[model samples]
Target: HHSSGLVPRGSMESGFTSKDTYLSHFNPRDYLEKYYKFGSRHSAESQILKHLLKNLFKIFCLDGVKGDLLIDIGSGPTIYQLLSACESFKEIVVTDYSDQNLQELEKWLKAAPAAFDWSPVVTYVCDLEGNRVKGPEKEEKLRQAVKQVLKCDVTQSQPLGAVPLPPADCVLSTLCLDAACPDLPTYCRALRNLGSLLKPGGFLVIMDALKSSYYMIGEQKFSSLPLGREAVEAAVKEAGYTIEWFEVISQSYSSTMANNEGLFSLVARKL
Candidate 1:
């Protein structure tokens, strides 16, 4: 006797719902962080977390990557992970598909352009929703200002050539991958695309939730499948990337959180 409200908005069937699944209110502004104007602020707790995640990424396994070029796909909210590469990289490309999100990222950079300075050449507004940025305009300028924000779709077998210019040394993501691609093939191909952007000996760093699937925004639910350490190691090997570094991090906000939290953070090098 469950109310339809209790059922997940993203799933067709009810019992299939995961701990992170919930209903979607359909208001993008409310559910999606991009819907809020970038300059618009959240609570102190949110800001603290943003800074915390950024600092942690500073110490991630990619220590030697400081002087190389790197690209982060699906760069949402312009999180600190992106900021972490600012001064360290020769060129850093931050990308996302949500126009609002990209716009917000721009606004955020302008207001609080991190204490660290980076000559990031672009703020790529990815073409995921079948939209295009064809000419100069207020929005296009915001996009064009960064090193190079082009219309690349990462989940596809190939990036639409819009990712950015690079003899890239590394590819980065915090909680991407499963949130964007379809099947394992596309995911692996996407890795291949990332590999193509890098030299034969480059690297990839990914820190994300594993095993936990689906997420909520207000009451709205969205699909997300976090690959466990075993799956990630297997997938990376299959994708032609060698395992150099990996770790499973236990996380919890409440005691009720799962023991393992099914979370993982890993780094792989392109062979």
Candidate 2:
């Protein structure tokens, strides 16, 4: 039995788990089932997804986020974040720390038999765009736009390591920094690493859980660096970015899956 109160608050210590340990047991399928199922619209997870997609669509479509290249860091076997992005970027690259997660993404990108069904999410995003485009068509478009799936480690000074990638017009990361970084300083460093991947005046979008220290996939629990809105804004500014837009939606329901009080989404432009 787990209690949210029992989990450490305000830091990634006490019951904090390492990225390696979390990845070792990370099941992409289970993760999708837990957080991406879209079974109940009222679910906290589902609401968060809606908030993210709506903002992404606004940024990409209505707010003029189009570009030649976009890079997604810490893509965890999930493409929901990129559904709107594919419409805005000509070429997209997705990266993750876990090989299994990358494999899962490739499964979808290649239309493999074992790939998780993303039709529901795709439909939602397409509807937001107010187009008559079918879900599969949008999925195909995304597949065509995503050119590479590489390994990424934000904890490093160079998140992509030796990979040679041109600076992107936009860099997107969702619910990643808390897992990739163990502390506040590390989180700020990771922001800088992400900033390095973007061109000057390019966009950087981040969606993350607020005041959340842990989330569950099946019976395995993973740690997150509990973050506040001010901390995140300050970190983004310190990393040489100007905050373009910031929004936070409070969690409306209670669930033990994760103890996040709310979710925050931000769009920043590189200095």
Per-residue alpha-carbon lDDT of candidate 2 for residues 1-271, written as tens digits (9 for 90 to 100): 3434454332245456666664577889989998888665678778777888898899888998889999998999999999988888999999999989999999999999879999988999989999769998999999999999999999888998998999899999998888777788888889998988889899998988898877777566677888899999999999899998899888632456877888888889999
Local accuracy of candidate 1 as per-residue lDDT tens digits, 172-253:
8765676655456766777787777777777787766566555555445445555667777887899888886677755421
Alpha-carbon RMSD of each model: 10.0, 2.9
For lDDT, the strongest prediction is 2
Score every model by TM-score.
0.66, 0.93
Q: Quick one: how many clashes does candidate 1 have?
A: 11
Q: lDDT of all predictions, in order shown?
A: 0.52, 0.85
Show where candidate 1 strays beyond 4 Å: 1-62, 112-146, 160-164, 252-260
Off-target runs (Cα >4 Å) in candidate 2 are: 1-15, 252-254
lDDT at 189, model 2? 89
lDDT of 2: 0.85
Q: Give the TM-score of candidate 1.
A: 0.66
